[PDB]
Nucleic acid binder design. Structure first.
Lengths: 58, 159, 222, 51, 185, 172
RNA sequence: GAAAUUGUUGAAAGGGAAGGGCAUUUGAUCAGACA
RNA sequence: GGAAUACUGCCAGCUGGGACUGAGGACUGCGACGUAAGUCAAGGAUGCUGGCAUAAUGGUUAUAUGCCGCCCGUCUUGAAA
RNA sequence: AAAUAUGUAAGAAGUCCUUGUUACUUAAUUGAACGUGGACAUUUGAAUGAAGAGCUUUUAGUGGGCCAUUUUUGGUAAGC
């Protein structure tokens, strides 16, 4: 009672029914996988520029 | 049984570009890569560590991480009915700068240069690109160019 | 009260200058239609008298008519036909001739018949099968005010200004062509002229590149 | 409420394109062209009539 | 035959009339349908869409959320409009005077506004005051703070509150949740 | 393929910035209209020169009329046809009144006797035979005799009505 | 006191099935408005 | 040397015969023809005349004729089987 | 070393200028990343099209397929 093993028929038509879509890019993307040494300094860089503008519009 | 290893069906993809064997030239190690740059992937067979997968050969992505001797790229991979974002760690020997972005920049500089001179002298810069328009009417002269009459050649075997 | 005769007389007077502006501009198109036709004929005669050959400029507009039906179409020609607004058989549209659009026509050649239209067949198409696209509605033109309401910002304010924008491809061809609804034509009154329809016109069929003989077949379908 | 076809209804043919009234005056479609009398050059004759 | 590109006879997918049978709510829909059709003001079109929303699409707005919106620059005199129910918050002690117009008012929220010298009016009294919605401020509550929201999109490496009845030990904290037993999710 | 006409077509293949004023090739085309005359022009230039339609352009297309369309001429026609097995050359002679009428008879004769369609026939050269006693074919030399007279026996008189009241006669 | 089924009477059709759809003739029968 | 004709194309050129359709229901709009008053083929048919008021038309039904029509449900890639 | 298919780019989330932040980096205010302020608008950066774009929840049926054009494997071949 052998059956049919595998086929790719109707697979491209099914994928195009709802359409293949873009990954919906955003501004300020996720920082997963970035260098931890660079990210440790960037956290302090934003801390110093937040209080700099706080002392400019005090 | 079947075989689906990491470097399967990579007999000719990872070859060494006949008569370019040996060490790699030093200009590939002195090129800088910043976050946001556009690069294309072409794996090197002489460098084993940091080798990309066979799917990513020829793809183009955006650099998002700059490591010591490697870089991080972003590749959009089509899985099923959607595109999935992939983060890859490749050494600098398997990548190079993408030239498709290069000519875009001086077009930005030329468009700013063409527009800057026209603000002083005139409206309608006409800074857009246009396709190959159909050719216009001209006059064909036969002075010294008398048309030679051709005819089809009779069948000759010459085996 | 008021407004029974006052602004009616003002409206009937204000509409009169629009009829005068259209009349003088339509007159200006008639002189340059016949001037551009005599000059090409005179340029061909002068080059022959000077021992030369005068070639003409390549046509900058084609009229594409869909021949093949709906069923059994490959996806790449199916997407191209949807980008030319040819969704049914015997449908027609104007296409600007460039390098990008010439490659589009070669993909759907076994399904469409196209060619270079003249002024007489273009003029008869807008008058009989001219329909505008206003708020996703297929509104017949039928008047110079409706064309002025939706296309009046790009100069065109009459039915002949739109016609002049088509045959003389100007800076606003994209907005003028997209305003027109795709043409719904019938079957030709004298037949297709060939025993079999789905062959190339060079080989004896009906599709492919088919130049100014296209005016005979379009006028029979109109 | 009904689409009346121009080119066979003269009242519609005058509502649209008011230039059509004076188009029938000079008739503007049976215009006689100026008769020029230049002849093609000799080199074009034997090229067309070549074997 | 027409080669269809989109779906034929597809509905808009938006509500055009409330599903409720409230005769008083339909009177406000009847009143504001006339206003949005004959004023050409963007305020009246928002109210019709907000009046068609369901119960979960109209979260309650606390009285402290109104007081935070009146602390903005040049917004202390704008009439607060909330299409929903205004609830009372006991975490605040100083409330301003500016009036609030809303559909429903609770016993605690109505008494707190009036005691501070405010005014609680209905949505039909706003139509005779601001037909064009002048000097108004539309406030609506958070939609993703619902208990059913956190269970949406459950999957591996999502952390999206798997659906359970009882919580604590021996309830979905074994293999599949920690590295000691098998794998971490 | 239809009622034929004779055209002349001139090519130019596009002048680049390196080589201006090209050689301006020309040949003669037997076709039905101007659509196929340009198509059959590029078919033979791809058999003789490094050129195609995209690399060249058409200079002038002119219809060639018969100089003496009311004179019976003897033509010698060289053709190159493709059969089911191999390609062969053939020389045929047709007695007609014009160059375009001899081509019409040739295409009907080649399709009837050799089953050769229009796409498999190449027209090498058609030329008028100036003098007599140069006709080497027997089916043309019969009509060159002095005082040629021949009857038409068994006249088949075509009728219109279905029933005739007389017995027909085939006299002539 | 229904149907399957059966008798009688009346009407109609029938050259190795019957039944059906569209159209009309013929026969039977029915309706409307008569403002 | 001077024309005609054929062929192709154009006319906001003229004109005859036939067929199907008459939707909408105060006025409004765009126009045309006129010195004007107004008129008009201008955002959808009116005018005149005859015949029958009964089986004239139409509906129902039986039969005849022309063409077409294989068994219903079910499993199945596939059922008149 | 093709043809056909295939990745990326064709701008405002852009370009340029000025100088602020850091515990990172450099011999070094050098660089890096992120900002402040200023300048440049829709012929604003090819073509065509768009019964709009984006997002979420929930649930049914299905998980025995077959045929044809072309490419191709086993087989003498097959409605294999």
């Amino acid at each position: 009672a052998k059956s049919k093993n595998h086929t790719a028929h109707n697979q491209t038509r099914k994928a195009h029914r709802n359409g293949i879509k873009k990954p919906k890019t955003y501004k300020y993307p996720s920082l997963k996988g970035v260098d931890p040494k660079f990210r440790r300094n960037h956290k302090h860089a934003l801390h110093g520029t937040a209080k700099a503008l706080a002392a400019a519009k005090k | 049984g079947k075989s689906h290893g990491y470097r399967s069906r990579t007999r000719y993809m990872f070859q060494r570009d006949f008569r370019k064997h040996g060490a790699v030239h030093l200009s590939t190690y002195l090129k800088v890569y910043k976050v946001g740059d556009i690069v294309d992937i072409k794996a090197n067979g002489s460098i084993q560590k940091g080798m990309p997968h066979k799917f990513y050969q020829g793809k183009t992505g955006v650099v998002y991480n700059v490591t010591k001797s490697s870089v991080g790229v972003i590749i959009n991979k089509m899985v099923g009915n959607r595109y999935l974002e992939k983060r890859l760690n490749l050494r600098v020997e398997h990548i190079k700068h993408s030239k498709c972005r290069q000519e875009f920049l001086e077009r930005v500089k030329a468009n700013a240069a063409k527009r800057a001179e026209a603000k002083a002298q005139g409206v309608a810069v006409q800074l857009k690109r246009q396709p190959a328009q159909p050719r216009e009417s001209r006059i064909v002269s036969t002075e010294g160019n008398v048309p030679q009459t051709l005819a089809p050649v009779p069948y000759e075997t010459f085996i | 009260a008021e407004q029974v005769a006052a602004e009616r007389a003002a409206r009937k007077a204000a509409n009169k200058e629009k009829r005068a502006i259209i009349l003088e501009r339509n007159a200006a198109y008639q002189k340059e239609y016949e001037t551009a036709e005599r000059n090409i004929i005179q340029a061909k005669r002068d080059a022959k008298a000077a021992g030369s050959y005068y070639v003409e400029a390549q046509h900058k507009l084609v009229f594409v008519v869909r021949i093949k039906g709906i069923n059994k179409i490959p996806p790449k020609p199916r997407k191209v036909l949807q980008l030319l607004r040819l969704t049914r058989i015997n449908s027609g549209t104007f296409v600007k001739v460039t390098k990008a659009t010439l490659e589009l026509l070669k993909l759907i050649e076994p399904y469409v018949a196209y060619g270079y239209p003249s002024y007489s067949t273009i003029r008869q198409l807008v008058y009989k099968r001219g329909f505008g696209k206003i708020n996703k509605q297929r509104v017949p033109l039928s008047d110079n005010a409706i064309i002025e309401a939706n296309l009046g910002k790009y100069g065109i304010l009459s039915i002949d200004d739109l016609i002049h924008e088509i045959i003389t491809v100007g800076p606003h061809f994209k907005q003028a062509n997209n305003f027109l609804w795709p043409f719904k034509l019938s079957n030709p009154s004298g037949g297709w002229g060939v025993p079999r329809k789905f062959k190339h016109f060079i080989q004896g069929g009906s599709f492919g590149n088919r130049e100014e003989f296209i005016n005979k077949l379009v006028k029979s379908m109109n | 409420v009904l689409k009346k076809n121009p080119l066979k209804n003269k009242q519609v043919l005058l509502r649209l394109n008011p230039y059509a009234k004076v188009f029938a005056a000079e008739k503007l479609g049976s215009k006689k062209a100026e008769k020029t009398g230049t002849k093609p050059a000799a080199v074009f004759t034997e090229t067309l009539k070549h074997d | 035959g027409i080669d269809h590109t989109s779906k034929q006879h597809k509905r808009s997918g938006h509500r055009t009339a409330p599903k409720s049978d409230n005769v008083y709510l339909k009177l406000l829909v009847k009143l504001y349908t006339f206003l949005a059709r004959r004023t050409d003001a963007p305020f009246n079109k928002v109210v019709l869409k907000a009046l068609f929303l369901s119960k979960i699409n109209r979260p309650p707005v606390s009285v402290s959320r109104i007081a935070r919106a009146l602390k903005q620059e040049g917004a202390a005199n704008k009439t607060v409009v909330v299409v929903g129910t205004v609830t009372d918050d006991a975490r605040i002690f100083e409330f301003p005077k500016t009036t609030v117009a809303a559909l429903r008012f609770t016993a605690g929220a109505r008494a707190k506004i009036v005691k501070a010298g405010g005014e609680c009016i209905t949505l039909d009294q706003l139509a005779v005051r601001a037909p064009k919605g002048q000097n108004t401020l539309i406030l609506r509550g958070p939609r993703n703070s619902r208990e059913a929201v956190r269970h949406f999109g459950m999957g591996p490496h999502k952390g999206k509150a798997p659906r359970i009845l009882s919580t604590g030990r021996k309830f979905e904290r074994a293999r599949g949740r920690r590295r000691s037993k098998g794998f971490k999710v | 393929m239809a009622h034929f006409k004779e055209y002349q077509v001139i090519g130019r293949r596009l002048p680049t910035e390196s080589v201006p004023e090209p050689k301006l090739f020309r040949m003669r085309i037997f076709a039905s209209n101007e659509v196929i005359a340009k198509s059959r022009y590029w078919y033979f230039l791809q058999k003789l020169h490094k050129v195609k339609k995209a690399s060249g352009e058409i200079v002038s297309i002119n219809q060639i009329n018969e100089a003496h369309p009311t004179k019976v001429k003897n033509f010698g026609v060289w053709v190159r046809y493709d059969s089911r097995s191999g390609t062969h050359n053939m020389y045929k002679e047709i007695r007609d009144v014009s160059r375009v009428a001899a081509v019409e008879t040739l295409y009907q004769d080649m399709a009837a006797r050799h089953r050769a369609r229009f796409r498999s026939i190449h027209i090498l050269k058609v030329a008028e035979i100036e003098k007599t006693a140069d006709v080497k074919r027997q089916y043309v030399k019969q009509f060159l005799t002095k005082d040629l007279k021949f009857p038409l026996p068994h006249r088949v008189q075509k009728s219109t009505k279905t029933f005739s009241y007389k017995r027909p006669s085939t006299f002539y």
